Each structure stands twice: as structure tokens, then as C-alpha cells.
């Protein structure tokens, strides 16, 4: 509960993020994979059901960060329409992250280092069971523009301590040395979110 020990105050806050825990992550981030395997954010949601939980991908990370942002924005949008929390293991967000984490870390896939975005999109499109056209049409919408703009802030936040980064109410990033357990993450989030 002390600035500079458990948390820092972001110089610029995430817009529209009151009463929320947001995980800034990358598909090519190993600890992000760990936190997905043990569904950390889902554990927080269980103990703090009334917060909003989001995942902000980091477009500046990986050869395909910019394409991943599109796919995750589409998953977030659809999870929203479907009223499934993105920390739910049945969400499209979770299914998409699982597929990319699996591909990147277990299969050591790199999709030709940036030269084959079609193969990269396909992992996410298959995971969501939608077509490339669905994605192209989503990307024409204002809802897509808003999600993709909101994700821009994940890039400067990721430079504070790397990924994953945990941001509460859009204003405070939990300092990673303070997160010694999901219990600690929950306690800190509960303190910072009131």
C-alpha cells in the first residue's frame, strides 16, 4: 500500500478504466504465458467479482505485435458481445492467447520472422473460429478503432517493468517485486481499487 514499493502511479493513465484490473501482456512473453497457464487474472476475478478485467496486448513486442493487437481486439469485442469475461477459460480471449502461447513457446513457431502474417493471423482466426473476412470487416468498425487506440498505452506501460504488467483502475501499476503470490496480487488490487 505504499507508492514505490507496492505500486507506481502511471504518468499517463489508461482511459476509461475505473474499477478495473488490466493485464498488459504479449504473446511472446514467457511470464505472460505462466500467468495464463495458472489463470492469474481469473483468480483475481473470483475474489473481486465486481471489477472489470481486461487484457491489453503490447503491439511493440514480437514480429507480429501489431497483428496480434488486431486479433485480440476482435476477441475482446466478441467476448464483450457474448458477455463472457476474458478471464474465463472459455472466452475467445483465452482461446486466442492459449493458441498463440502454444504456438510461440511450445511449437517454437516464428512464422518466418514477420514475412508470413497470413500464417500468424490464421492461428488466432482458427482459435476464434472466424474467417479473415470477419476480421477485416471488424477492423473497419469504430469499435475496432477504439480498442486498438486503447491498446496503444500498453507500449509505454510495458517499458516500466516489462510484461506482464498489472494496472489497477487505470492509474497504478503494481510493482512486480511486490507480487509474490496471487494472494498478494488480490490483496494489492483490492486495496488499490477502492
Residue numbers in the entry: 1 to 194
What does the paper say about this structure?
The bacterial proteins of the Dsb family catalyze the formation of disulfide bridges between cysteine residues that stabilize protein structures and ensure their proper functioning. The oxidative part of this network consists of two monomeric DsbAs (DsbA1 and DsbA2) related to EcDsbL, which cooperate with one DsbB. The solved structures of both CjDsbAs, especially the length and amino acid sequences of their L2 and L3 loops that are essential elements of the monomeric thiol oxidoreductases, were different from that of EcDsbA but similar, though not identical, to that of EcDsbL, which affected their functioning.
CjDsbA1 crystallized in the C2 and P212121 space group containing two monomers in the ASU for the monoclinic form and one molecule per ASU for the orthorhombic form, while CjDsbA2 crystallized in P3221 with a single chain in the ASU. The entire length of the polypeptide could be traced for CjDsbA2, except for the C-terminal HisTag. The active site of CjDsbA1 was observed in the reduced form, while the CjDsbA2 formed a clear disulfide bond. This was due to differences in protein purification procedures. In contrast, the CjDsbA2 experiment was performed under native conditions (without DTT), as the CjDsbA2 reduced form did not bind to the Ni-charged resin. Additionally, the observed effect may have been caused by the prolonged process of CjDsbA2 crystallization (several months) and spontaneous air oxidation or, alternatively, by a photoreduction in CjDsbA1 during X-ray data collection. Redox potentials for both CjDsbA1 and CjDsbA2 were within the limit characteristic for monomeric DsbA oxidative activity (−60 mV for CjDsbA1 and −116 mV for CjDsbA2). We observed that the CjDsbA2 activity in this test was slightly higher than that of CjDsbA1. However, in contrast to CjDsbA1, which in cells lacking its redox partner, was mainly present in a reduced form, the lack of CjDsbB led to almost undetectable levels of CjDsbA2. The extent of CjDsbA2 reoxidation by EcDsbB was rather low, and it did not complement the lack of EcDsbA in either performed test.
